[PDB]
Amino acid sequence: MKTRQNVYELKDDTLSWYSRAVEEMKSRDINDPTSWWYQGAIHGYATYPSALTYWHDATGYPPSQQTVNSGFWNRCQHGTWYFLPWHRMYLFYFEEIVAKAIRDMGGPADWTLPYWNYCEAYNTSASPSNQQQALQIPPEFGSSQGPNADFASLWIKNRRNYVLNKNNVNPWPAMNEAEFTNSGGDISFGGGVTGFAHSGGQTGQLESLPHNVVHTDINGAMGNPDTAALDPIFWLHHANIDRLWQVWLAQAGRSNPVVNAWKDFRFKFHDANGQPVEIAVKDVETTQLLGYVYTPAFPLSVVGATSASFSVGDHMAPLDLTMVRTILRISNVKGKGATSPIDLFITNRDNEEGNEENFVGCIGLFGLENASTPSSDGSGLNFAIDISDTINKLRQRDDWDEDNIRVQLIPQSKQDSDVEINVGRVSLHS
Incomplete structure (x- = not known):
């Protein structure tokens, strides 16, 4: 079993290996599925001006039309009950590709993606240093002024905020909801019913907050779904959201949807070895099915x-x-x-x-x-x-x-x- 750790509780070389992995993955060609750029593009990819500012920095840009129209790009599920399972699967294969680059450059064999728990700002039991720290992008990711010279690859131009507004990281509205999805238009933890939905209108509570607001707070690449997965912080953000799904389910009487329309839907990715792969939603219903756990952190335990x-x-x-x-x-x-x-x-x-x-x-x-x-x-x-x-x-x-x-x-x-x-x-x- 692997363990995803809280980024601010790390005592090992997790972030330094991450930096080296991103640097190596950035040196790969956009058309290669194990490249930084292709991984980003699975979430979202476009070339209208506000998107092109980021994508033209990609190694090998522009990609071939065969890549663009392969069926593996622009797959992110937004505004939809598929939001959480899709991001769990996306993470899982990215971590495989990152872990393998680390292994291949002589690093540890068991690298896992940590989570950034910005929600710790709401933990009244933590020291206010831990609370205020929670709102900050970790310092390995650079500052407004530039990269951290010792982890240069973790930086990206044009981030608007390095410190989150505390309004944006309250986990209670999501944790407090009882149903994953309702049919009754009453509120839902995980989103509403849709089919395949790259830009859905059924945003659930966790997707709304902290997820969407963290994206438009940091902004830059992170503000736009067509660029967001290019920012290296994207993944640690999503590891926390993934963890919050697990935390929700640990509450009594919470469950994922039982119906086949949800359980049996399949999504395509590429694995650590760059081979096309597919999983069903039901395959990611717990993290232990994918061979990982999280360390414990805060929320856990018409008129x-x-x-x-x-x-x-x-x-x-x-x-x-x-x-x-x-x-x-x-x-x-x-x-x-x-x-x-x-x-x-x-x-x-x-x-x-x-x-x-x-x-x-x-x-x-x-x-x-x-x-x-x-x-x-x-x-x-x-x-x-x-x-x-x-x-x-x-x-x-x-x-x-x-x-x-x-x-x-x-x-x-x-x-x-x-x-x-x-x-x-x-x-x-x-």
């Missing part, structure tokens, strides 16, 4: 709607909800550009503005333009949040009035000028 679609700029005024467990739904979000995570507040009084006491949650517009475009029936991203706790607070204000409920959506950082966000509908349901 109202908007009357039509609207923009989210830098600082909208709070928007009235037309009144007709409480769930806030944010539907059919479309647009483009390198967004930041969107903070959400509910207000009640006439000059009230979003604040720490008002705050109900945050959404990450990861994949926004892909979901906005038909090819994808183009209906945009959809999000749902349990806000029962905040609402019940506000509800015991003396001046609480149910007809004065407003919503405000505020990006965590000022938008770049080519950003556009249109929300289809915000609604509140009970």
Whole structure:
């Protein structure tokens, strides 16, 4: 059995071998399936200008049309109950390819991918140094100023943030959900029903937070599904998400979906030896089936709607909800550009503005333009949040009035000028 470790609890040479593996994999040709570039492209690959800035750095760029259209690229499952199993499989084969490069250069035989537990920021039992550390990209990955000279390959240009906003790493909304998927449109841990979905509209709670918001917080390559897997931090992020699935299941009465439509769906990859391979969802239902465990870390152990679609700029005024467990739904979000995570507040009084006491949650517009475009029936991203706790607070204000409920959506950082966000509908349901 191999063990995936917490990156900030490492006492071995895991990161130094990772760096050397990335350097070797980056020196391979984009058309080679064991290359850095091909592995990235399995998640997402495109050559419109904001994507091309990254991909033209690839060794051997441009790839042959036979590679592009092989059927192995642009396979990532987003907005869908397939999200978690697909990423587990993706990880598993990447780790095989990384482990083998390490073996082949004379390194250890048993290398495993560690996880970055940004969720540790919420661990009140940890020392506040451990808490604040959790929000930082590990220092082997470089800084705004450049690579760490001793691990140069772990760096990539244009990361917008090296320290996460703590709103984006709360694991409780996901852990707290009971069902993996529902049919009833009630909330789900693992996403909603779809078929094959490269840009789905059934984002589940774990996919939403911390997953999507971490991507648009770090941003750069990481902000766009067509480039994200090029960033070496991608994999440690995903190892934590993978671990959180395992942690969820360790809660009593939690289970994955039993139905065949989920269990028997197959996805294609390439193995350590660069051979085409396939697994079924059911083949990754626990990590022990794939020969790995995680070390233990923290979490372990319509009453109202908007009357039509609207923009989210830098600082909208709070928007009235037309009144007709409480769930806030944010539907059919479309647009483009390198967004930041969107903070959400509910207000009640006439000059009230979003604040720490008002705050109900945050959404990450990861994949926004892909979901906005038909090819994808183009209906945009959809999000749902349990806000029962905040609402019940506000509800015991003396001046609480149910007809004065407003919503405000505020990006965590000022938008770049080519950003556009249109929300289809915000609604509140009970």
